Amino acid sequence: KETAFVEVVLFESSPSGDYTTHTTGLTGRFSRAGAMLSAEGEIVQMHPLGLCNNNDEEDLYEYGWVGVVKLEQPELDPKPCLTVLGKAKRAVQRGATAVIFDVSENPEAIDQLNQGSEDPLKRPVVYVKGADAIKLMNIVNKQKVARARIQHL
Amino acid sequence: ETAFVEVVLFESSPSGDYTTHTTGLTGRFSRAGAMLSAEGEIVQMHPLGLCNNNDEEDLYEYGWVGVVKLEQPELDPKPCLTVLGKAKRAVQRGATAVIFDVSENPEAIDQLNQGSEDPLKRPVVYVKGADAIKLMNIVNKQKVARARIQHL
Amino acid sequence: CKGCLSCSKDNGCLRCQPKLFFYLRREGMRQYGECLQSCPPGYYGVRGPDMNRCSRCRIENCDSCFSRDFCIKCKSGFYSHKGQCFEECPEGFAPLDDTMVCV
Amino acid sequence: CKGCLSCSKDNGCLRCQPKLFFYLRREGMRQYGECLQSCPPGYYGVRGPDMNRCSRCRIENCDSCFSRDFCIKCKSGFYSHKGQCFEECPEGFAPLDDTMVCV
Numbered sequence: 001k002e003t004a005f006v007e008v009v010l011f012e013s014s015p016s017g018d019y020t021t022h023t024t025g026l027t028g029r030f031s032r033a034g035a036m037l038s039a040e041g042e043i044v045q046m047h048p049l050g051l052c053n054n055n056d057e058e059d060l061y062e063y064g065w066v067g068v069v070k071l072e073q074p075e076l077d078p079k080p081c082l083t084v085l086g087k088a089k090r091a092v093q094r095g096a097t098a099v100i101f102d103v104s105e106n107p108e109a110i111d112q113l114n115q116g117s118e119d120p121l122k123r124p125v126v127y128v129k130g131a132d133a134i135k136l137m138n139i140v141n142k143q144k145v146a147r148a149r150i151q152h153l
Numbered sequence: 154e155t156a157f158v159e160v161v162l163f164e165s166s167p168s169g170d171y172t173t174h175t176t177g178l179t180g181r182f183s184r185a186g187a188m189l190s191a192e193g194e195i196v197q198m199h200p201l202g203l204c205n206n207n208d209e210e211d212l213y214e215y216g217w218v219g220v221v222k223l224e225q226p227e228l229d230p231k232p233c234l235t236v237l238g239k240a241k242r243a244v245q246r247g248a249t250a251v252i253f254d255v256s257e258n259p260e261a262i263d264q265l266n267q268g269s270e271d272p273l274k275r276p277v278v279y280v281k282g283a284d285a286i287k288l289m290n291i292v293n294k295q296k297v298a299r300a301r302i303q304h305l
Numbered sequence: 306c307k308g309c310l311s312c313s314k315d316n317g318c319l320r321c322q323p324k325l326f327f328y329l330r331r332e333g334m335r336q337y338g339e340c341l342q343s344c345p346p347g348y349y350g351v352r353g354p355d356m357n358r359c360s361r362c363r364i365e366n367c368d369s370c371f372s373r374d375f376c377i378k379c380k381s382g383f384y385s386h387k388g389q390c391f392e393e394c395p396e397g398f399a400p401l402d403d404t405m406v407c408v
Numbered sequence: 409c410k411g412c413l414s415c416s417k418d419n420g421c422l423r424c425q426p427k428l429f430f431y432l433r434r435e436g437m438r439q440y441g442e443c444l445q446s447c448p449p450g451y452y453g454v455r456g457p458d459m460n461r462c463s464r465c466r467i468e469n470c471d472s473c474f475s476r477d478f479c480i481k482c483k484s485g486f487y488s489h490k491g492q493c494f495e496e497c498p499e500g501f502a503p504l505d506d507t508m509v510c511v
Contacts, residue, residue: 009215011247017210019247038190038303040249042216047316047336049356050329057363058169059331063161064192064299070315077319079355095163095171097192097299102315137315144333147216151190199419199432199439209466211434222418229422254418289418296436 001114002036004028004126005151006100008043008139024139026132028100030152031110032117033085034125039098040149041066045140048072051090052081058094066148067091067099068140071106084109085116088125098124098150102133126150154188156180156278157303158252160195160291176291178284180252182304185240185268186277191250191302193218197292200224203242204233215247218300220292222254223261236261237268244275250302253279254289278302308340321357326350328359349373365390379405411443424460429453431462452476469493482508 010022030036044065051069069087082090084101091099103109110127128136139146162174182188196217203221221239234242236253243251255261262279280288291298306312310320317337321327325340328348344350344359346369351358362369366383367376367390375388383390384400386407394400398407409415414422420440424430428443431451447453447462452473454461465473470493471481478491487494487503489510497503501510 011215013212013215013247015209017207017212018245019215038192039301040190040192040216043334045335047329047338049319049327049338050336057167057361059361060165060169063163063165063171063173064194070313072311072313072316072319076311081355093170095165097301140334141315146334149191195437197437197439199441201422201430201441202432202439207463211464222416224414224416224419224422228414292437293418298437 001029001032002152004030004124004128005153006126006128006136007149007151008136009147009149010139010143011147024135026128026135028126028128028132031113031125031127032120033088033113034092034099034121034123036152037098037124038149038151039066039124040147041097043068043140043146043148044096045069046087046091048087049077049081051087053086053090054081061095063095064097065095066150067096068102068136069099070102070137071104071109073105074108084112088113088116088121092121092123096123098126098148100126100128100136100148100150102129102137103127104129104133124150124152154182154184155305156182156276156280157305158278158280158284158288159301159303160288161299161301162291162295163297163299176287178280178287180278180280180284183253183262183265183268183277183279184272185237185265186244186251186273186275188304189276190304191218191276191300193249193300195220195292195298195300196248197221198239198243200229200239201233203239205238205242206233210246213247216249217247218250218252218302219243219248220252220254220288220300222289223256223258225257226260236264240265240268240277241273244273248275250276250278250300252288252300252302253277254281254285255279256281256285276302276304308342309338310340323357324352326352326357326359381405411445412441413443427460429460429462467493 006026008024011019041064045068088099158178160176193216197220240251308325309318318340321340328339328341329336330339347362348359349370364370364376366380369377379385379390384394394407411428412421421443424443429447431442431444433442450465451462467479470479474480482488482493487497497510504511
């Protein structure tokens with residue numbers, strides 16, 4: 001399983017039409033659930049209980065977003081609508097160009113995702129933890145919008 | 154330094170799922186920009202669409218993959234900027250990559266690669282031939298498309 | 306992070322107190338759980354085995370509904386008859402004067 | 409593809425017949441040149457030896473510019489002075505209200 005170099009970009013237009021940035025790099029890992037591919041797109045956080053088969057017409061997000069899903073301690077939801085792979089699959093069906101799980105509270109998720117390696121999704125499914133995870137989350141909760149660039153070297 | 158470019162047409166369904174169509178095409182990474190993979194909404198820029206001489210220009214959402222069909226260099230004998238300049242200008246206005254259609258002006262390839270000393274942070278790709286025809290046709294024919302550019 | 310049984314900094318509400326309904330709120334980039342007394346406009350309740358849950362009001366030119374197919378406020382140009390909006394009021398009932406409703 | 413000295417399927421007009429105004433039209437993904445007699449509404453001309461181009465009228469409160477700093481048409485209600493747009497005409501120019509001007 002390869003290393004996922006992720007950059008999260010904050011951007012602001014100036015008056016002249018040009019852009020200024022700020023860019024936080026993190027590390028993660030590409031799962032075998034998904035392809036080994038770089039991906040870039042606006043980040044969209046997805047609550048874990050908000051990725052399910054069950055809903056007949058879910059809300060619509062522009063094609064080519066990057067999901068971010070903070071997983072919670074596995075016992076806080078014992079009868080989940082879908083497994084962590086199912087959730088990944090939804091995201092991508094709904095147009096995620098990649099999905100990043102934060103697995104800090106749920107390190108078992110990793111092995112589950114990798115047990116999806118026959119039938120892997122066409123798009124990348126990265127996971128992040130620890131300090132790398134804390135960063136991503138801080139940005140998500142605190143800032144308005146952000147762009148992820150995930151590289152596979 | 155080969156650029157593997159995919160152009161992706163997409164439609165939502167009633168379910169909220171997407172279906173797509175994807176055209177793969179090939180170009181090269183100019184040494185004028187970083188040798189990095191890139192993905193974004195394609196925005197076409199007219200060659201003159203990229204000139205320094207405006208105090209404020211119209212604003213595109215950060216993260217776009219500009220495309221520029223270059224013309225025979227005599228159609229503008231004295232350009233507002235070089236290609237290098239136009240490329241820089243695009244990235245300053247947030248383009249995440251710049252793809253040049255150099256078919257009608259292949260020495261831009263050289264002019265462009267002259268930037269290898271002060272290179273842009275983002276990729277600058279050039280296409281031509283069939284590859285460029287496919288790119289231009291889609292751009293002409295459709296409302297939107299997502300370019301994925303890869304460095305493998 | 307309120308009305309909440311389980312609760313996290315990043316996801317808001319994860320479990321509601323039982324007579325409260327779970328709603329996923331988008332605030333820009335973020336999507337977090339809220340535990341609400343009543344569903345908000347455009348939504349309606351469901352009290353359910355997995356959860357008590359706020360579903361999307363799926364109904365004809367109508368901002369708010371109570372139920373699966375009972376509309377409350379239609380969008381104007383509609384005539385609310387027996388909980389389903391319509392084009393005209395049906396033969397039997399009439400468009401009211403200074404009302405957006407049938408009889 | 410008219411008004412046009414040079415012209416491409418891909419970029420539309422590339423240079424204009426000398427009296428006419430070069431305009432970038434946005435149309436989905438496309439950006440191509442038009443050569444116009446009048447800059448369209450919301451725009452104004454910037455005639456030059458090299459060429460004439462249209463520019464976006466960016467006067468706060470104004471609809472159509474004659475030029476960068478001079479508004480032709482204020483939006484609904486507003487008051488006109490030095491061809492700027494106003495809520496009410498400031499001190500030292502008595503707003504002849506009927507007319508939506510100052511004096």
